[PDB]
Amino acid sequence: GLSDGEWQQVLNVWGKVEADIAGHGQEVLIRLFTGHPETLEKFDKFKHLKTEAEMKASEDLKKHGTVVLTALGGILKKKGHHEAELKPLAQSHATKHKIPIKYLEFISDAIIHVLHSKHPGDFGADAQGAMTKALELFRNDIAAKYKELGFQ
């Protein structure tokens, strides 16, 4: 649950992402894959990537980064009223991709890391607080659907 002022911070930060969605999406996935190499094994189309240089050179990884952040941005713009947008993603990630909630924690922290890396000194403590709360809400509502499905 976020206040109006917190949502305003989230959507202000998101403007930074929308200026370069592919570059942000690429770096988020690279941070996930290099920090948590077990996550790469869930992607049949990226498991061939052995080095970060190959990851950086992969145009399909940048494409998928655009898909991921476009979906997340659509959810964030609903300011919590995201049941219709979130349900299909919860279902596909639990039942088809088999993504444990832990990996959603990993990618949430990766987003925070990338924002500081690309905007050092321009991602203030209030903005980090609000973005963190928004990603916690996203993860918590996914977790509720995971529990319904019995997925661990």
Residues near ligand HEM (CB under 6 A) are 39, 42-45, 67-68, 71-72, 89, 92-93, 97, 99, 103-104, 107
Give the nearer residue to ligand HEM in terms of CB position, either 5 or 88: 88
Give the nearer residue to ligand HEM in terms of CB position, either 67 or 149: 67
Give the nearer residue to ligand HEM in terms of CB position, either 55 or 104: 104
* CA separation for the pair 41, 92 (Å, rounded): 17
Is 97 annotated in a binding site? The answer is no
Q: How far from each other are the two terminal CA atoms of the chain, in whole angstroms? A: 25
Give the nearer residue to ligand HEM in terms of CB position, either 45 or 78: 45
Tell me which residue has tokens 């977790």. 143
Residue nearest to ligand HEM (CB): 92
- Who contacts 17 (Cβ-Cβ below 8 Å, separation ≥6)? 24, 69, 73, 115
Is 93 annotated in a binding site? The answer is yes
- Who contacts 51 (Cβ-Cβ below 8 Å, separation ≥6)? none
* CA separation for the pair 136, 75 (Å, rounded): 13
Tell me which residue has tokens 């088999």. 98
Residues annotated as binding site for heme b? 93
Residues annotated as binding site for nitrite? 64
Residues annotated as binding site? 64, 93
